[PDB]
């Protein structure tokens, strides 16, 4: 395992708060849905996470259940890396 060397980050005036909302929503759900582990990962600045994995491992779930679960993970996969690049989503 590891002790904890996540690292450090910078703070720049740009979509700093906005992201907080988009993320908070996803996280709150991850824990307010049944997966208290998916809401803790992001909290530890672990994201983005292996989306394709959450599916392969949870292949048992149904298409709807999976899609819904992913709809949250993805939203974070970008809200946790957006730092690198804004991310022009059709704009």
Curated annotation (Swiss-Prot):
Q: What highest taxon heads this organism's lineage? A: Eukaryota
Protein localization: Cytoplasm; Cell junction, Focal adhesion; Membrane
Q: In which tissues is it expressed?
A: Highest level of expression in the spleen, with rather lower levels in prostate, testis, ovary, small intestine and colon, but none in the thymus.
Boundaries of every SAM domain copy? 22-85
| Outcome recorded upon mutating residue 46 to G | Abolishes interaction with EF1A1
Q: What does UniProt give as the signal peptide span? A: none
This protein's domain notes: The SAM domain mediates interaction with EF1A1, and functions as an autoinhibitory regulator of RhoGAP Activity. The polybasic cluster is required for activation and mediates binding to phosphatidylinositol-4,5-bisphosphate (PI(4,5)P(2)) containing membranes.
Its biological function?
Functions as a GTPase-activating protein for the small GTPases RHOA, RHOB, RHOC and CDC42, terminating their downstream signaling. This induces morphological changes and detachment through cytoskeletal reorganization, playing a critical role in biological processes such as cell migration and proliferation. Also functions in vivo as an activator of the phospholipase PLCD1. Active DLC1 increases cell migration velocity but reduces directionality.
Task: Describe its partners and assembly state.
Answer: Interacts with EF1A1, facilitates EF1A1 distribution to the membrane periphery and ruffles upon growth factor stimulation and suppresses cell migration. Interacts with tensin TNS1 (via N-terminus); the interaction is decreased by phosphorylation of TNS1. Interacts with TNS3 and PTEN; in resting cells, interacts with TNS3 (via C2 tensin-type domain) but, following growth factor stimulation, TNS3 and PTEN are phosphorylated which leads to weakened interaction with TNS3 and enhanced interaction with PTEN.
What is the protein named?
Answer: Rho GTPase-activating protein 7
- In its UniProt entry, the species of origin is given as Homo sapiens (Human)
| Encoding gene per record | DLC1
First and last residue shown, out of the full length, are 452 to 515 of 1528
